[PDB]
């Protein structure tokens, strides 16, 4: 349901606005730390000059960037957004890619392996129905990607004024090679993204992700998983969560609720220079797997 694509859907960047591509009002996202934001609250109001096309360019060449997109909701202000529309309606699970000057629906998870889509944004649903959508990009991207969202207010009319059509284009350039960590496996995508693979039937080497200051770690957890003490209750062999052990580290997908990819990532800060040797575990339902994390050995 949330991930349902319509293969027959077609649109264009300009939509039905009659604006040629040379006349788009292009601008960049408001980038702060690792959060790139395209806010349309003030951009799409009905204007005399409208309909104008306003394109927000999200250019990503770094890992673990979070993209927030704010699209004003119908009725947030009376009359000004009465006929607003957003595309795809199943964003961010569904995005638009350019195929022959045409935009068609594609699953974002198949475009970028490892992409984290949380179910909630600020404890509201992660859907344009709540006005905001978010997704975190992975620590590794191999092929360049370009996908689009639409937040179109051009059909809204107020006296002689008309709203504007909003376009967000996310441009991901390649970055990274492999993720320091382990993939518990049963595609080639699962095998090539992590430095160590752990097979279920006959394993010799348990999970050993070796981190240093500035490095990114990750774990692809087994599909069948009961619980894990990994990154919240860790055992030093030299304040038990990794956050408490490494001040200002960040763990992505703490709650393991992201769709598709059962992964969480860790970022060791460049400041952190002390040495640490930790243990956590992964429980299956059916045995359990041991995880050894070393930092700055």
């Amino acid at each position, epitope marked *: 349901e949330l991930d349902k694509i319509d293969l027959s859907y077609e649109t264009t960047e300009s939509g039905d606005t009659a604006v040629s591509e*040379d006349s788009y*009002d292009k601008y960049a996202s408001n980038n702060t730390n690792k959060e790139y934001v395209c806010d349309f609250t003030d951009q799409l109001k009905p204007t005399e000059s409208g309909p104008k096309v306003k394109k927000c*360019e999200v250019k990503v060449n770094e890992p673990l960037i979070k993209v927030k997109i704010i699209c004003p909701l119908k009725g947030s202000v009376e009359k000004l957004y009465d006929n607003i529309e957003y595309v795809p309606k199943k964003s961010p699970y569904v995005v638009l890619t350019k195929e022959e000057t045409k935009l068609k629906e594609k699953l974002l998870s198949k475009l970028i392996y490892g992409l984290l889509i949380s179910p909630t944004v600020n404890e509201k649903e992660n859907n344009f129905k709540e006005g905001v959508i978010e997704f975190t990009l992975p620590p590794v991207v191999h092929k360049a990607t370009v996908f689009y969202f639409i937040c179109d207010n051009s059909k809204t009319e107020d006296d002689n004024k008309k709203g504007n059509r909003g376009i967000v284009e996310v441009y991901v350039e390649p970055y990274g090679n492999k993720i320091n960590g382990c993939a518990f496996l049963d595609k080639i995508k699962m095998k090539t993204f992590f430095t160590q693979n752990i097979y279920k039937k006959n394993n010799i080497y348990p999970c050993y992700m070796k981190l240093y200051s500035g490095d990114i770690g990750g774990i692809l957890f087994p599909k069948n998983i009961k619980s894990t003490t990994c990154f919240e209750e860790m055992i030093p062999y030299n304040n038990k969560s990794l956050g408490n052990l490494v001040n200002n580290s960040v763990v992505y997908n703490k709650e393991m609720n992201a769709k598709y990819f059962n992964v969480q990532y860790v970022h060791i800060p460049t400041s952190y220079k002390d040495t640490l040797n930790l243990f956590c575990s992964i429980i299956l339902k059916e045995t359990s797997y041991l995880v050894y994390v070393s930092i700055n050995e």
Partner: single-chain antibody
Framework: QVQLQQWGAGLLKPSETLSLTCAVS????????WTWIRQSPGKGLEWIGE???????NYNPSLKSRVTMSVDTPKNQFSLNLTSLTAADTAIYYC????????????????????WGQGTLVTVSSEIVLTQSPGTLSLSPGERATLSCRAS???????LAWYQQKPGQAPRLLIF???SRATGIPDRFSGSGSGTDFTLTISRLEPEDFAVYFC?????????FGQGTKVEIK
């Protein structure tokens, strides 16, 4: 209402340093590639380099040694510094707004230049090659003009633009994507072609349509122009 104010010292001795600055208004300084372009007598149109709001640069390999560009994003300005000046650097320098659109084609950028600045004459005194044919068309009003632009190597996609330069003015964009009319461009201007062969067709000439027409490719950096085709009366 995109305006590009341009200023800088124009009368310089050899070996001195040229410094031009351009100020943007009516457009968001983020989201375009602010470029410099010069038009020299004989040499023709030449792309110098580009810079965005983040400070990232791309320079022409020919001028790469002597060219430096900067941005002062607060004031929405960007600047050029050409060094080791010679007489061959005498030309009209244009501030220009490059579209700067992203493409999955490598080495390519959707980077036709529109609008251009008014131009600054700099006087020194004390690759994909596009070949346009003809060099000169002599025709009367109401007749059809057909111009050709041929590239030394295939232009990926249809990443070609055409420009019109009326006498005494800066170029203005006519066509982008080989065959897409720009905003405010009459229907009598039609573009066509793909690969290495492109044409610009002016179906029913009118007295002001007598200008110089250039093609530009943005499929492989450095962005290059044709030598021009002059359209005149007969």
């Amino acid at each position: 209402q995109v305006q590009l104010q341009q200023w800088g010292a124009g009368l310089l001795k050899p070996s001195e340093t040229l410094s031009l600055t351009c100020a943007v208004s009516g457009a968001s300084f983020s989201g375009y590639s602010w470029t410099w372009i010069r038009q020299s007598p004989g040499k023709g149109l030449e792309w110098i380099g580009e810079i965005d709001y983040r400070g990232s640069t791309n320079y022409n390999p020919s001028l790469k040694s002597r060219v430096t560009m900067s941005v002062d994003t607060p004031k929405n300005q960007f600047s050029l510094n050409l060094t080791s000046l010679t007489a061959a650097d005498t030309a009209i320098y244009y501030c220009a707004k490059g579209y700067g659109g992203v493409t999955l084609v490598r080495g390519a950028k959707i980077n036709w230049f529109d609008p251009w600045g008014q131009g600054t004459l700099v006087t020194v005194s004390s690759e994909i090659v596009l070949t346009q044919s003809p060099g000169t068309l002599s025709l009367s009003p109401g007749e059809r003009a057909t111009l050709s632009c041929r590239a030394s190597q295939s232009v990926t996609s249809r990443y070609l633009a055409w420009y019109q330069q009326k006498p005494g003015q800066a170029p203005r964009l006519l066509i982008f994507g080989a065959s897409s009319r720009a905003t405010g461009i009459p229907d009598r201007f039609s573009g066509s072609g793909s690969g290495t062969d492109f044409t610009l067709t002016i179906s029913r000439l009118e007295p002001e349509d007598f200008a110089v027409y250039f093609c530009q490719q943005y499929a492989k950096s450095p962005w290059t122009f044709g030598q021009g085709t002059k359209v005149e009366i007969k």
